[PDB]
Design a protein around this ligand. Sequence first.
Ligand SMILES: [Ca+2]
Ligand SMILES: [Cl-]
Length: 157
Amino acid sequence: SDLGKKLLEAARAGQDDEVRILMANGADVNANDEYGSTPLHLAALMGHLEIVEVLLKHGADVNANDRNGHTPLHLAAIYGHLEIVEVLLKNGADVNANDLVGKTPLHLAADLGHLEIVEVLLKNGADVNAQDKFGKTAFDISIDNGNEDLAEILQKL
Ligand SMILES: [Ca+2]
Ligand SMILES: [Cl-]
């Protein structure tokens, strides 16, 4: 029986009770699939807050990269999952972690246009002037997208 594969599936699917049994049987909370996703990645992707919390207190790696370079915080940003963002920041996430195109969670939340997450990231240490691999800051992204409310927030001194 491959406990890690079952744990990945249970974390994605919101199966809290099965997550607990699998950990009780020794499942590796840092198991990964062929794309480098861990249970924390998938639980974050699906907005399963309680599973994220359980994985974190079991010691799951908070800043592990999947095959795109994304940490769980990148995924919480990209899709705009506010409560996930907040709990990862309280539990050791690297707010300025870069993916394979040089983007931080701030770049991803800015491209999404999620104002509240952008400000949570900034006020929890995001580098407002971080540049991705093609030289863009979050402000440049907001300009490119025409999101003037976001551009205002990003340029606030
Ligand atoms: Ca602060
Ligand atoms: Cl249980």
